[PDB]
Amino acid sequence: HQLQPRRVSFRGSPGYDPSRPESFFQQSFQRLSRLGHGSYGEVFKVRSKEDGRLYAVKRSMSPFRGPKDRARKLAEVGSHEKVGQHPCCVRLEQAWEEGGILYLQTELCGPSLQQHCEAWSLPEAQVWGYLRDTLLALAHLHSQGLVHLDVKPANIFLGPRGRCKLGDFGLLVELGEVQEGDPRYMAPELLQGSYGTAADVFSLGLTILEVACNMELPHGGEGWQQLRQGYLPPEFTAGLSSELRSVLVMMLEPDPKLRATAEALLALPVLRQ
Ligand SMILES: Cc1ccc(O)c(C)c1-c1cc(-c2ccnc(N3CCCNCC3)c2)cc(C(N)=O)c1N
């Protein structure tokens, strides 16, 4: 026998019938396509039986191994709930656990910035839009006392008319346990375990640099150090406007005390509206 699905929430069932053997995920949703799969889980585009609308659902790959594994996995939901509703953040609809598997249902977004780049050099007008939207997301996170420690192209998802939304909030920390971010985008102070609101501003700077120049960033070694000195190596700046370069260098200041804040960046004339 299997226990009924349980809602996961740190706040504290339309169409679903517990009498039938099918899971909540199978009874309550039509699976339309798989959007991703890896060690983090599988993500499906679905339509909801409850409201007829499209959503995305992420489910973990294997049943909880013990109480601590469960607690760590469920903690993603708590962090995502702290983000709540914001037009530049992936919105959580509901989360539940069944059969030792964790499910997060969110709004349905488009391809990641990584995918968008891979199937496109991006026009800079688009890049300015992604920078602005993700800056609005960071301003929101910081207001909630949250820092995203894995801002990267794969974690930003496109939306309507040039919009994008930041996601993957299992990598959020509060001002908690956290996994390792991608070294390519990591703020230099994190090497010493130091973090703050400045860290994801730096990561967003390299994120936008990478998508704007369409070149792989170094994961270590001299090249990694030379992106963390307060200048942009010419290797990465071919075709970048003077205006974009200047904003990126503000974001890439190695000293987190000196680095521009999200709000200061959003207040720049170039990032109006
Ligand atoms: C369902 C879900 C729950 C919580 C949450 O924070 C998010 C972002 C989602 C969510 C995830 C995905 C998706 C597609 C392919 N790969 C990934 N990853 C994992 C993140 C790290 N990068 C490695 C690849 C993620 C697509 C959408 C989407 N297109 O709607 C979506 N909503």
From Swiss-Prot:
Residues 29-271 form the Protein kinase domain. The keyword Cell cycle applies. The keyword Secreted does not apply. Keywords: Acetylation, ATP-binding, Cell cycle, Endoplasmic reticulum, Golgi apparatus, Kinase, Magnesium, Membrane, Metal-binding, Nucleotide-binding, Phosphoprotein, Serine/threonine-protein kinase, Transferase. It is an enzyme of class 2 (transferase). Mg(2+) 2 binds at residue 170. Changing residue 155 to A: Loss of kinase activity. The active site is at residue 150. It is a peripheral membrane protein. The modification Phosphoserine is found at residues 13, 39, 62, 79. Autophosphorylated. Phosphorylated by CDC2-CCNB1 complexes on undefined serine and threonine residues. The phosphorylation by CDC2-CCNB1 complexes may inhibit the catalytic activity. ATP binds at residues 35-43, 58. Its EC number is 2.7.11.1. It catalyses: L-seryl-[protein] + ATP = O-phospho-L-seryl-[protein] + ADP + H(+); L-threonyl-[protein] + ATP = O-phospho-L-threonyl-[protein] + ADP + H(+). GO terms for molecular function: ATP binding; kinase activity; metal ion binding; protein kinase activity; protein serine kinase activity; protein serine/threonine kinase activity. It is found in: Endoplasmic reticulum membrane; Golgi apparatus membrane. Interacts with CDC2-CCNB1 complex. Can also interact with PIN1 when phosphorylated by CDC2-CCNB1. The membrane-association motif is essential for the localization to membrane of Golgi stack. According to some authors, it is a transmembrane domain; the existence of a transmembrane region is however unproven. This is Membrane-associated tyrosine- and threonine-specific cdc2-inhibitory kinase. It comes from Homo sapiens. The gene is PKMYT1.
